[model samples]
Target: SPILGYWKIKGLVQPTRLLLEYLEEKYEEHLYERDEGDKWRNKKFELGLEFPNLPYYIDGDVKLTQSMAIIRYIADKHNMLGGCPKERAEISMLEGAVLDIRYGVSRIAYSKDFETLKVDFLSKLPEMLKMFEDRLCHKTYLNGDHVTHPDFMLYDALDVVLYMDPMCLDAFPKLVCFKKRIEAIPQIDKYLKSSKYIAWPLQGWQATFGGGDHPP
Candidate 1:
């Protein structure tokens, strides 16, 4: 059975969709629009849905939310998670750290205010690039040789960064390399260039990226 996914289909769910598509994982996406009487976003799945939110996934009969939880679930089942217990713990910490930045990232996306985003993103500059910058210098992938779930998370986060500030990564060479490294994956490379990957929404905040017309 397909993992039944319900979400905006373009927002926070992009990372999960990246993983699923990159791995050729089995699943089906039920996309919901932002408004209107007949839209999926407006309706309720009263009984089956729990702790409901976008990027929600239905596995067998159980419904799951929380983006990291959902991504980790599928990654664990598929062995995309890193090696031994110690490695896994380290991976989890990085994942948690990634999520910390992600929350702020989403705020920037939702607000679409360039000035605030620039200051906020730059203020946390150390908190943002410190870990990943060093990590990339030492490994082929963030966790090692394999492309773990967090790579997708960071890669998607970079997408937000690029969308908001075109020059954000200019000072972080390794981080920039990491972004290119992840994208260079054959599966990921194809999907990124393919029409299936969404480029922009018809409406709402598009998030401020560096040197864009949307000034901070």
Candidate 2:
């Protein structure tokens, strides 16, 4: 049975797709067009989906949503969650923290009052970076030596940061190294190079960032 992974381009759904790809999970993607009328809502209700938003997964008779929940579920089933309860809890906390950071960024990204949102979140980023730096200095991966859901979540979040603020990762070397290490995994490497997994031109933020004319 092919699982259905529903999402929109250049949104929070990419991370979920990346995770499924990394796990080599067999699934069918249902990409919705931005201009499509009530596509997302229609799909959700049509299937009686488990979650309230996009990035939902449907495996045979099962349906689930919430990106972190989906990531953790897949990770646990594949023995990628963590080795112990403590590690799992830590991973969960880290995952939550990453979501918090993303929520703050989203505020800036979609705000009617961009200046206010940017000022608040941008001011708080240094402290957040320091926390991540301290954590990364002690552990090779977010949850320790083993790669877990938080690792992927963090990397994807950083990818968003890179697009939003090109200099975002400069102050976080460990995170950069972490992403490189994960990308070095043979499965992940193959997916990165694969057309099915690698996002096409205009499918990612490149389209929004002025494409080729954008400053680096």
Candidate 3:
């Protein structure tokens, strides 16, 4: 079986996890915990990984680090990259945009100035979402009528964005519909409700926002 190593929190690996579940790929999760001090540090270099980072993936001869690299590798293998050259280009572009937004929020979430930064984030969020709203107005997914890797990426990004402000999407009905579409996929829907799902603690324990011990 393949393995994905990351902190116990969702963070960067959630989209990869979402992709694996949507593909019904059987893989093992090696989640590190903050409470178990020094565990990741001690084990990090011993994993035979060249870069040795969290959110690493190993499957027989293929070992990967970097979340997007791992995601594209899996997506390429499973025909999820896109159907054509143009589609692939579009998908990658959307993937880049979604990741930028996701990480932007993450930076704020983990910072000491979360409360201060969050206000600025909320103000700019409508502009960010409007891009998607306009793009999605005539399309069912980011690329078109078909689901692609960026669709998963966008879903997770939107999910994290919603965590920041639950009512943020009230004006972006198209993006909202896109989110519901992803959520309704049977495989994703099941995994979401399964015991394997971890809905909270979206960041590491040190984060100032959306961070805490795993729910009891």
Candidate 4:
């Protein structure tokens, strides 16, 4: 059977979500309505969710929590992790860097540093993107000549930065093209255009994080 997915309406499990869709893996989502009060939220700890977390996965005898762990497992299973040991290590390194990229975006999503972050996100975008653009200038993929788990992770991380600044991709032509390459895939393209997909939740942390003038 397909894996069982459990998460809120947001793209917190985006890497995993895109992986499953791209791989055409069978899966089912257990949607939780944030506005439904505690009615849906409290069910997060239900029996099958071993770690009792927001993003959990269940596949036959294995029940997993943590989006990273789950996505890594699936990627390794599907050979998307990497083809060889050295390539795997390289992907791991890039994956860590991508995580940092997304983490910074998450941190600045709140009122804590909204203004500074707007500038901070834009300021660091060039250098960060250039680093990848340079690395990718010679290769089609981060670790090799083909796509892998790190590719989707990269897309997810970059989205936050680009969402903060739509024109940010312009500074890195390679990435802009690389992203275009990924989106053109039939499976991913169709799923992305599907109405069931929720790229952003209606109720994000911004409002609850002490609403202020956050960038659109």
Candidate 5:
């Protein structure tokens, strides 16, 4: 089985985790605590990774880091990369866009001025999501009718966005539908409801925002 190493928090590892669950792959998680730097630091040089970093994956001899590379490798192995060149381009494009949005959220969360940042982000949220809304309005998945790697990426990105603001998607009905569509997948749904799932504290403890769960 593959072993994934990262902080106990979601961070860049969540999309890969979602993909693994969607494919029903059994893997081991090597998690580190936020304050325990030595735990990961000690093992970092031992992993034989060319570019050692958190969220490294070691599957037999295929030891790798960089979350997107790991995601592509797994998705390509499962024939989820895309059907052809155009499809591949679309997948890549969408994944990049999703990453930008995810990072935007993360940047604000990690900032000390979280309240002010949140207000600014919320104002720009609809315009940011509108592009995806247009693309998905006529398609089931971001890549097309069939589920693809970028679909998983988009799902994870939108999930965190929604977590930041529950009503953020109210204007983007298509995005709301996309969320349900991903959730309705049997394996994904099962994993989501399982205790193994980690849905809170979307960022690490260092984040000024999303460092803990919001009040119910």
Candidate 6:
């Protein structure tokens, strides 16, 4: 049976869609507009599907929420989590770090307090980018030479940052290279350029946030 994926546009849920696409998973997306009203929202909650907001998945009798959890579950099912125990641990650490950055960036992106947002998110991202650069210095991927969960996380995270702030990755050349490397993968490349597996173009936020134009 095809999995049912529900999500709102331009949110953290986007990465889950991308990961599913990357894995060539068979699924159907339930895209919703943010301001559509309470009708759809209530329906979801009434169906025992609430918490963490959109990007929930329904696979057979299983129903799940949270983007990271969905991604990890899909990765494990497809044997894409990692090849070894150590690599799996590294993937978990990297995924956690990416979530930290996502939360930090969300404060800036969604806050009404512009001054605090700029100071806390805009000003601090460079330092964070430097740390990522250092990590990418000797490794092809975030964990090592292998393309594990971290690589997907980095690519998706960077794409989100670039959508919000074009200059966020200015100092992270290694990350830029890593993004390119992932894009160039034959399977990934073909899927990215194809219509069936891609979803960003149909996203409601594409006009305001711009298309997925992140480097690489």
Q: Which candidate gets the maximum lDDT versus the true structure?
A: 3
Q: In model 5, which regions exceed 4 Å deviation? A: 213-216
TM-score of predicted structure 1: 0.82
Question: What ranges in model 6 sit over 4 Å off?
Answer: 46-53, 82-85, 194-216
Tell me the tens digit of each residue's lDDT in model 1 across 81-117. 7678998898898787777776676555555565666
Candidate 3, residue 172: the lDDT equals: 87
TM-score of each: 0.82, 0.81, 0.94, 0.86, 0.94, 0.78
- After superposition on all C-alphas, the RMSD of every candidate to the true structure, in Å, is 3.8, 3.7, 1.7, 3.1, 1.6, 4.4
lDDT of 1 at 128: 73
lDDT tens readout by residue for model 6, 131-157: 778888877877776666666766776
Q: For residues 1-216, could you state the per-residue lDDT of candidate 2 as single tens digits?
A: 446455345356655666777777777777765455377667667877755666677776667877667767777778876668986677778888887776666645644465466667667776776677788887887767766667677777676666656777788788778779878888778887886653422222333331222234
For candidate 5, lDDT tens digit of each residue in 96-146? 888988889998888888888889888888888999999987788876778
Model 1 alpha-carbon drift over 4 Å, by segment: 4-9, 36-38, 41-43, 108-114, 201-216
The CA lDDT at 10 in model 5 is 76
Superior candidate under lDDT, 1 versus 6: 1
Check candidate 6 and list the clashing pairs. Answer: none
Error of 6 at 77 (Å): 0.6
Write down the lDDT that model 4 would get: 0.71
lDDT of 1 at 142: 83
Report every candidate's CA lDDT: 0.69, 0.66, 0.86, 0.71, 0.86, 0.65
Q: Which is better, 3 or 5, measured by lDDT?
A: 3
Model 6 root-mean-square deviation? 4.4
Ranked candidates (lDDT, high to low)? 3, 5, 4, 1, 2, 6
- Residue 96 accuracy (lDDT) in model 4: 86
lDDT score, candidate 3: 0.86
